[PDB]
Scaffold this active site. Structure first.
Site, mmCIF file in Angstrom:
data_model
loop_
_atom_site.group_PDB
_atom_site.id
_atom_site.type_symbol
_atom_site.label_atom_id
_atom_site.label_comp_id
_atom_site.label_asym_id
_atom_site.label_seq_id
_atom_site.Cartn_x
_atom_site.Cartn_y
_atom_site.Cartn_z
ATOM 1 N N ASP A 258 -3.620 1.382 14.521
ATOM 2 C CA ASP A 258 -3.880 0.077 13.938
ATOM 3 C C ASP A 258 -3.678 -1.006 14.995
ATOM 4 O O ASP A 258 -2.961 -0.820 15.979
ATOM 5 C CB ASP A 258 -2.956 -0.139 12.737
ATOM 6 C CG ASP A 258 -3.144 -1.483 12.076
ATOM 7 O OD1 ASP A 258 -4.303 -1.885 11.851
ATOM 8 O OD2 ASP A 258 -2.125 -2.133 11.763
ATOM 9 N N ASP B 115 1.342 0.182 10.756
ATOM 10 C CA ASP B 115 2.487 -0.540 10.217
ATOM 11 C C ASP B 115 2.218 -1.155 8.849
ATOM 12 O O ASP B 115 3.123 -1.777 8.283
ATOM 13 C CB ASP B 115 2.926 -1.650 11.171
ATOM 14 C CG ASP B 115 2.015 -2.863 11.115
ATOM 15 O OD1 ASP B 115 0.803 -2.708 10.849
ATOM 16 O OD2 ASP B 115 2.521 -3.986 11.316
ATOM 17 N N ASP C 190 -2.734 1.446 6.275
ATOM 18 C CA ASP C 190 -2.641 2.645 7.093
ATOM 19 C C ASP C 190 -2.029 3.827 6.358
ATOM 20 O O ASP C 190 -2.128 4.954 6.852
ATOM 21 C CB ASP C 190 -1.814 2.369 8.353
ATOM 22 C CG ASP C 190 -2.343 1.208 9.151
ATOM 23 O OD1 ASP C 190 -3.577 1.079 9.270
ATOM 24 O OD2 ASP C 190 -1.524 0.423 9.663
HETATM 25 F F1 BEF Z 1 -5.345 -4.034 12.073
HETATM 26 BE BE1 BEF Z 1 -4.502 -3.070 11.183
HETATM 27 F F2 BEF Z 1 -5.345 -2.811 9.917
HETATM 28 F F3 BEF Z 1 -3.146 -3.672 10.795
HETATM 29 MG MG LIG Z 2 -1.089 -3.611 10.789
#
Ligand code: BEF
Ligand SMILES: [Mg+2]
Length: 1003
Positions: free
Chosen positions: A351, A696, A700
């Site tokens: 992410d 985080d 996710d």
């Molecule tokens: F960019 Be991730 F979805 F926090």
């Molecule tokens: Mg994130």
């Protein structure tokens, strides 16, 4: 209420029978509480010890050991006597080993689960609801909120539940949705309905989802979902619904256990076949179905003796030591076999917001006017270090640290930044980190002002709580803050009236929207008429900052030196705000972004060296995503990303072959839904790739559970830490690289003590079967074979887990997921060794019966036919019948086996590196454990009661020299095998140390 974002405020208010002015009544409160229930997510906790042990016994090796233990128990029961304790000592210790293994596994699981609960802020969740009890707002618990309640929320509070916005009390409402959508910038919300029914959470700009917090403003809305009906609740349900497979190490161990079971069952039926038809003799029987019982009893006991016993114990010890070494690097691992998963990882999905970057906007560039030459200018540019909200970073002009006191333009810039914003920076002593109060794009300016000390105040004596707002407090004391002209979407800026303790109006806004009104330039302390050249130069520099390699949110900062007084000011209409600042003096500009973590740039490179492909899957737009990709190192500063950067729709509109080529070559997926990340991870695994996902946020959680290993950040949401197999308690991405090293070393060492044990055991098979074929007296009995396989095979096999890792371990691609633990060659390579343990041990015993001076020098016929020696003198003229029960040949065989095992642990230090080039003192734990095993073996010989338990007796010097003569050639055998393996004396002190032993033994 279905699709509340598509319906106007009036009809959604009427559907629940609630009035926005009054609220709900207690009758409706109970009527909705009885249907929907509490507004909270169902808690799933760790199971009891029993259901944990049930899965601790799920390994195939543990099932094989339990089967062998039950088999040997029902075999020891055939004796009518129940007091045969020497027979029941084997299943008891096997059960003890299995129970200890299960207990260690459960203890590690529980310790990991407890270590993650400490990474959770114990905050009570509250909400502000308008109910018909009292006219004023009611602060209640968010669990009691039911669909239909009017909720009023202001700046700095979390959204209690899914709320359809009804009214915005302030001019605008800015909400942080980084938890659910992954967006770095706050979103402006409006009460207007969204026409698209299947719109994504980012398109819904009239809804406030649960778990998010308000960045700025104040508003009132109507709850439309609670509990599991919220968006985060739907994501948690989707996460729970996902399947959980077995780790790659568990699969390799299951394959090896299948191979072992195929091997064990082979020798059993082989012995049974070669011994069938051999009970047609009338002795102790007289039938054929009865003849297959004694031979079955001996063959099954042999096959069970073939099985290693301490293998799961040493595997669990190695995995637990790996988990301890990882937890020393602030990494919580739930399962033991998950420590190896990052070692075989091919792809690391990650992410962006909060995982690869921080979630803390920070000013990284700024520029003012240094000089002017005519129809042009010179821009004095500075770069500021620091990627968090902590006011610790420094400012550098070009490459050197500078002081901002000499610059008057920087003083004016800091004054504008400290006075034009309405946010602040506080310190949480509970978590020990600095936090923002309002919007991130103003806390950035607060931390910038705190960084550049324009007044040279002393912050060394101040504590952390005072050091967060010291410089801003000084600047506010120097200039009193008057009324603030509110930010308008048409003017695209905001200003603040100021009277010192003449009147100045500080304006802050978009670069072009503000500079279109600035008519003068502030250079140092001098006002200068503005021309078109200065304007175009500043605009070109902004466009360079606003895009390209560094995509920065730019912010122009200007001042008004001659503003009209507040008496002539009229704040009723928003359109007067822009005309009140028609003439401005441009002071400078700043550029801030969501900065990547300081350990990611080197980590992507180190993972590139180790053969790991890093992919970014994020919910933010493709612009910021590709900017951070180019920044951390996934992409190049000029690399074309046409077929390497996708979106959700751009990936959905691809054919299966196009999606295959994408998942095989793409490196950045932006604007993806929480199910899109799971789809990407599932595709990457469908291409037979061990995938790791780092995240985080809630978005996710469905992906972290799909990956073979999912890593969560120590500051992320609780759902992400729930769906994760590892947790980075310190938000350190470099730790991941370290983990990738350990899973690479451990597994290597693992194979070592999987061979050194297995081979050893097959030796004790060839020792017995041959003794049954040649007919010689029994040389090795199971009562001492158990002591061998445990003590003198667990200490070296444990010390083999401390082997020094290779020099090019993190410079080679990850291992093929198809190759097994024991290959074909490594199979033969141990069989040979096993054969040498079968030929030597038996031989040693025979030696004492044939060529030993102290031993009765009987013939081979008298040796093989020792059963006929019970008679007085059929063919044995002078030999003793009692001497065939002597413990001297048994001690010879046991000592030869133990010495061969010590030498085999010596030359098991490396798979192919010879013992000469890698001396044994490289692994001092190995030589220490060898010394300990030999000391415990000599202990078995020379203590009082133990030599009676094992049918063995101490030896002399000549028999020990013979033991060495018989045992040492195993080193030459393994060296020859290693040479053959490599091709198809670097340590000279080792050679000069072993030459005395060789010349003294073979003298
Ligand atoms: F960019 Be991730 F979805 F926090
Ligand atoms: Mg994130």
């Amino acid at each position: 209420m279905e699709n509340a974002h598509t319906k106007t405020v009036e009809e959604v208010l009427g559907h629940f029978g609630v009035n926005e002015s009054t609220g709900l009544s207690l009758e409706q409160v109970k009527k909705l509480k009885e249907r929907w229930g509490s507004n909270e997510l169902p808690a799933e906790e760790g199971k009891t010890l029993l259901e944990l042990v049930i899965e601790q016994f799920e390994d195939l090796l543990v099932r094989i050991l339990l089967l062998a233990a039950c088999i040997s128990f029902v075999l020891a029961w055939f004796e009518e006597g129940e007091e045969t304790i020497t027979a029941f000592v084997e299943p008891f210790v096997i059960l003890l080993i299995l129970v200890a293994n299960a207990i260690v596994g459960v203890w590690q699981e529980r310790n990991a689960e407890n270590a993650i609960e400490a990474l959770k802020e114990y905050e009570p969740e509250m909400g502000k609801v308008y109910r018909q009890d009292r006219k004023s707002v009611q602060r209640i618990k968010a669990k009691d909120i039911v669909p239909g309640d009017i909720v009023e929320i202001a700046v700095g509070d979390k959204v209690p539940a899914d709320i359809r916005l009804t009214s915005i009390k302030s001019t605008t409402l800015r909400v942080d949705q980084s938890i659910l959508t992954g967006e770095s910038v706050s979103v402006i919300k409006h009460t207007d309905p969204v026409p698209d029914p299947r719109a994504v959470n980012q398109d819904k700009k009239n809804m406030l989802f649960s778990g998010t917090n308000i960045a700025a403003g104040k508003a009132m809305g109507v709850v439309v979902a609670t509990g599991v009906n919220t968006e985060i609740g739907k994501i948690r349900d989707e996460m729970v619904a996902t399947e959980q497979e077995r780790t790659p190490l568990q699969q390799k161990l299951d394959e090896f256990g299948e191979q072992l079971s195929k091997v064990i069952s082979l020798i059993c039926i082989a012995v049974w076949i070669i011994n069938i038809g051999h009970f047609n003799d009338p002795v102790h029987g007289g039938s054929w179905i009865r003849g297959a019982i004694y031979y079955f009893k001996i063959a099954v006991a042999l096959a069970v003796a073939a099985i290693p016993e301490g293998l799961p114990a040493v595997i669990t010890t190695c995995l637990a030591l790996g988990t301890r070494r990882m937890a020393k690097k602030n990494a919580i691992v739930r399962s033991l076999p998950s420590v190896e998963t990052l070692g075989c990882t091919s792809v690391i999905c990650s992410d962006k917001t909060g995982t690869l970057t921080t979630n803390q906007m920070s000013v990284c560039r700024m520029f003012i006017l240094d000089r002017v030459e005519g129809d042009t200018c010179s821009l004095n540019e500075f770069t500021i270090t620091g990627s968090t909200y902590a006011p610790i970073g420094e400012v550098h002009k070009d490459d050197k640290p500078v002081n901002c006191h000499q610059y008057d333009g920087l003083v004016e810039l800091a004054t504008i930044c400290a006075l034009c914003n309405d946010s602040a920076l506080d310190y949480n002593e509970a978590k020990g980190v600095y936090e923002k109060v309002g919007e991130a794009t103003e806390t950035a300016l607060t931390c910038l002002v705190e960084k550049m000390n324009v007044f040279d105040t002393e912050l060394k004596g101040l504590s952390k709580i005072e050091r967060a707002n010291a410089c801003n407090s000084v600047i506010k004391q120097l200039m009193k803050k008057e009324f603030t002209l509110e930010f308008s979407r048409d003017r695209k800026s905001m200003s603040v009236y100021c009277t010192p303790n003449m009147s100045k109006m500080f304006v802050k806004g978009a670069p072009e929207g503000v500079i279109d009104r600035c008519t003068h330039i502030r250079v140092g302390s001098t006002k200068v008429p503005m021309t078109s050249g200065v304007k175009q130069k500043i605009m070109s520099v902004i466009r360079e900052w606003g895009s390209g390699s560094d995509t920065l949110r730019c912010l122009a900062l200007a001042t008004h030196d001659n503003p009209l007084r507040r008496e002539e000011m009229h704040l009723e209409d928003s359109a007067n705000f822009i005309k009140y600042e028609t003439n401005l003096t441009f002071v400078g500009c700043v550029g801030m972004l969501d900065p990547p973590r300081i350990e990611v740039a080197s980590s992507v490179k180190l993972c590139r060296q180790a053969g790991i492909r890093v992919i970014m899957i994020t919910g933010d737009n493709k612009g910021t995503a590709v900017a951070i990709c180019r920044r951390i190192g996934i992409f190049g500063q000029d690399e074309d990303v046409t077929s390497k950067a996708f979106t959700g729709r751009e990936f959905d509109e691809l054919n299966p072959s196009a999606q295959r080529d994408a998942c095989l070559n793409a490196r950045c997926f932006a604007r993806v839904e929480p199910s899109h990340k799971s789809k990407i991870v599932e595709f990457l695994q469908s291409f037979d790739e061990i995938t790791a996902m780092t995240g985080d946020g809630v978005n996710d959680a469905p992906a972290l559970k799909k990956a073979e290993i999912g890593i969560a950040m120590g500051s992320g949401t609780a759902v992400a830490k729930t769906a994760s197999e590892m947790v980075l308690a310190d938000d350190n991405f470099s730790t991941i690289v370290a983990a990738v090293e350990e899973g690479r070393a451990i597994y290597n060492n693992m194979k070592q003590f999987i061979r050194y044990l297995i081979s050893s055991n097959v030796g004790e098979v060839v020792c017995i079967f041959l003794t049954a074929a040649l007919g010689f007296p029994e040389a090795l009995i199971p009562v001492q074979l158990l002591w061998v396989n445990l003590v003198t095979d667990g200490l070296p096999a444990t010390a083999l887990g401390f082997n020094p890792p290779d020099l090019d371990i993190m410079n080679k691609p990850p291992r093929n997921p198809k190759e097994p633990l024991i290959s074909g060659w490594l199979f033969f390579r141990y069989l040979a060794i096993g054969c040498y343990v079968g030929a030597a041990t038996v031989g040693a015993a025979a030696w004492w019966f044939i060529a030993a001076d102290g031993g009765p020098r009987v013939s081979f016929y008298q040796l093989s036919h020792f059963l006929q020696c019970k008679e007085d003198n059929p063919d044995f003229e002078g030999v003793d019948c009692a001497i065939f029960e002597s413990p001297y040949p048994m001690t010879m065989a046991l000592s030869v086996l133990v010495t061969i095992e010590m030498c085999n642990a010596l030359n098991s230090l490396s798979e192919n590196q010879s013992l000469l080039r890698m001396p044994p003192w490289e692994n001092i734990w190995l030589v220490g454990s060898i010394c300990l095993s030999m000391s415990l073996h000599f202990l078995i010989l020379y203590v009082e009661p133990l030599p009676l338990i094992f049918q063995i007796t101490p030896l002399n010097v000549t028999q020990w020299l013979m033991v060495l003569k018989i045992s040492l050639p195993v080193i030459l055998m393994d060296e020859t095998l290693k040479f053959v393996a490599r091709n198809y004396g670097i340590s000279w002190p080792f050679v000069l140390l072993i030459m005395p032993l060789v010349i003294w033994v073979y003298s």
